[PDB]
Design a binder for this molecule. Structure first.
Ligand SMILES: Nc1ncnc2c1ncn2[C@@H]1O[C@H](COP(=O)(O)O)[C@@H](OP(=O)(O)O)[C@H]1O
Ligand SMILES: Nc1ncnc2c1ncn2[C@@H]1O[C@H](COP(=O)(O)O)[C@@H](OP(=O)(O)O)[C@H]1O
Ligand SMILES: C=C/C(C)=C/C=C/C(C)=C/C=C1/C(C)=CCCC1(C)C
Ligand SMILES: C=C/C(C)=C/C=C/C(C)=C/C=C1/C(C)=CCCC1(C)C
Ligand code: EMC
Ligand code: EMC
Ligand SMILES: [Ca+2]
Ligand SMILES: [Ca+2]
Lengths: 344, 344
């Protein structure tokens, strides 16, 4: 089908210099993709044309976001709602209930030898499990979707911009997109990078923040990602939510999601769903916390997939100079647009 | 203690007219200092009596050269050998491992305002770091030296001749001194003057060669400088080496340095050390290439601190007339004296 309208470019000397300083140890390298220069991992290229042209189905539900914005929460909510609050069945791994469309791009099979070198103890891994993970990461995302039979509802996870996917997809599919204060996404993302060993242990959050707001982290530029989803926010098949609202009004956001998915929830059902997403409960939920991975040996001490679950904790990481920089960056990107974060 | 025995003179209308045509744009002016007429940036005067009288220490090691003769290599070899080949600890910046005795002199704080005018793009300066550099450059060398505590070994870099430093210093301290073919020193120096923006964009190598062999560039007259180190060549505490030898027999030179500093390196330790001074490897060594300065905004496009790393390349810059002129100049300073270069 349709030709892939995008070129890619390597990073120039300065961009390369910066990324290499913070993510250099990590074997997978980046490429800037399309006219907005979205950072993708190089393995993304083999499947770029396939995702653009992926066959979609009227029962597909997508959960989208720049990473670390509230995907996991939403996924759980959306899945339970569509599955008639069947909690019992929701106990299987998220990873097995959703397809992670663009999760594949992080691993380059040409460099299999290199990824355990990033771990403190390569000699502790569970190799049956770890090699299974590497094999799964090898299958492009488009194949995983396609694999799913038409009598099974597809639940899709993705951190992809809309312009890397079929345009007019919202003609066919429903999507919930999450956004979140960039400054908090920066901190969450920094830690997540620490979690998987994506970042050089000698780098610090400032460094990360540089890479981030300047548009040289995974799937940035940040505001372009969000701006795409914001511009389709009134489409009956699109639902634009802020992480912060989950904290302010969890009952209220649930009711919105059910309304979106064409479902009636009774006050109590929403309440039961509200208790379910309680941070401490969720955090110690085996089905959603990827603590299955820790057993494998690929998660760092200290870090966790479900971390603190608060809004505004960026003030704890940003210094005076950093705080001004962020204010000018958010100021410039919200100039001449109606996008507002309810927090600020 | 001890009065500074040297007088200083302004340049005459002649000398001035020439210097002025080649380096006029650069704020700092020169003075000829002492009976041999060493060119020194005016700001050198305020510290000259102090360097001449500076307290010295048994464990002090000095690396000395007329600039662009192989200081940087020598510093790295000496540093590593002294620190029991701890290649890790040497990953800090050379600037922080050595104190550049006379580095201060190129900046006159009275003309702070004038130094960013010489840049193509002053508006892209990193002010914090650039003002940081200016400030550091205002500290007399003698003071930086004095501040190193007695139980830290003092590594000194300098381009001063011996007569401007304590007489009899070689009773107390070791010095490695590097000499190099003047014609190559001229070319490296021309490019170096280009790197920092010292030289007028409209001047060329010929104009520069005029200044240099005539005794009207930084720290010339060239031959008087070398001759000084050469007469102390047999002193137990002086090690006179030629740049050309580092290319001819690097292992051989590393062994000589090693022995000078009092170490018995094994064949292999010398190998490890030579691989380390591999030109491409050195050039890309963040700790010695000064490319950290490029992000500040103070180096020129085109130029690099570690450039070509080759002997005999002056034949590419000298014309017929310049070559002969040079043949005559070199012969005249080597008349009645046992100083010979390996190259010629
Ligand atoms: N039930 C919940 N309630 C509130 N926040 C949750 C949550 N489950 C996960 N989170 C948080 O959402 C962020 C991850 O979002 P995503 O799923 O898009 O990666 C993590 O943020 P923090 O790192 O800021 O704590 C995490 O702690
Ligand atoms: N590892 C190395 N091997 C050979 N030459 C080196 C080197 N590191 C620096 N140099 C060279 O030594 C010269 C500078 O000397 P100094 O360190 O005293 O400034 C420069 O010469 P060229 O400009 O001729 O290339 C430079 O390229
Ligand atoms: C939103 C982010 C999530 C859930 C990220 C996790 C991603 C995965 C599956 C990472 C996996 C890896 C795997 C499976 C193997 C080697 C390295 C690496 C750490 C890149
Ligand atoms: C052998 C020469 C070396 C390594 C020279 C480096 C010199 C320095 C410290 C140069 C710095 C400058 C600084 C810091 C500021 C304004 C102008 C100027 C170019 C004179
Ligand atoms: C601003 C409270 Hg985390
Ligand atoms: C002798 C030519 Hg570099
Ligand atoms: Ca390995
Ligand atoms: Ca100015």
């Amino acid at each position: 089908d349709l030709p892939f309208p995008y070129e890619f470019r390597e990073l120039n000397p300065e961009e390369d210099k910066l990324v290499k300083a913070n993510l250099g140890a990590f074997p997978t390298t980046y490429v800037k993709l399309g006219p907005k220069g979205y950072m993708v991992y190089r393995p993304y290229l083999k499947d770029a044309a396939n995702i653009y042209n992926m066959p979609l189905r009227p029962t597909d539900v997508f959960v989208a976001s720049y990473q670390r914005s509230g995907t996991t929460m939403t996924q759980e909510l959306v899945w339970l709602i569509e599955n008639d609050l069947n909690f019992e069945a929701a106990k299987t791994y998220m990873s097995l209930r959703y397809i992670y469309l663009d999760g594949f791009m992080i691993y380059d099979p040409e460099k299999q030898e290199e990824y355990n070198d990033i771990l403190p103890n390569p000699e502790n891994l569970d190799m049956e499990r770890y090699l299974g993970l590497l094999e799964y990461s090898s299958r492009p995302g488009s194949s995983l979707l396609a694999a799913v039979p038409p009598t099974e509802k597809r639940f899709v996870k993705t951190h992809l911009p809309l312009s890397l996917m079929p345009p007019n997809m919202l003609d066919t599919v429903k999507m919930v997109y999450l956004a979140r204060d960039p400054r908090d996404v920066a901190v969450s993302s920094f830690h997540h990078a620490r979690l998987l060993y994506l970042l050089n242990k000698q780098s610090n959050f400032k460094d990360f923040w540089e890479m981030f707001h300047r548009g040289l982290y995974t799937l940035t530029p940040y505001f372009e990602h969000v701006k795409e989803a914001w511009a389709k926010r009134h489409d009956p098949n699109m639902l634009f939510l802020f992480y912060e609202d989950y904290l302010k009004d969890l009952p209220g956001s649930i009711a919105r999601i059910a309304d979106f998915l064409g479902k009636k929830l009774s006050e109590e059902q929403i309440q039961r769903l509200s208790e379910h997403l309680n941070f401490e409960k969720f955090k110690n939920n085996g089905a959603v916390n990827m603590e299955d991975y820790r057993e494998i040996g690929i998660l760092a001490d200290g870090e966790h997939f479900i971390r603190k679950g608060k809004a505004g904790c960026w003030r704890d990481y940003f210094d005076e100079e950093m705080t001004k920089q962020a204010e000018k960056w958010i100021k410039d990107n919200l100039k001449d647009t109606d996008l507002r974060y309810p927090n600020m």
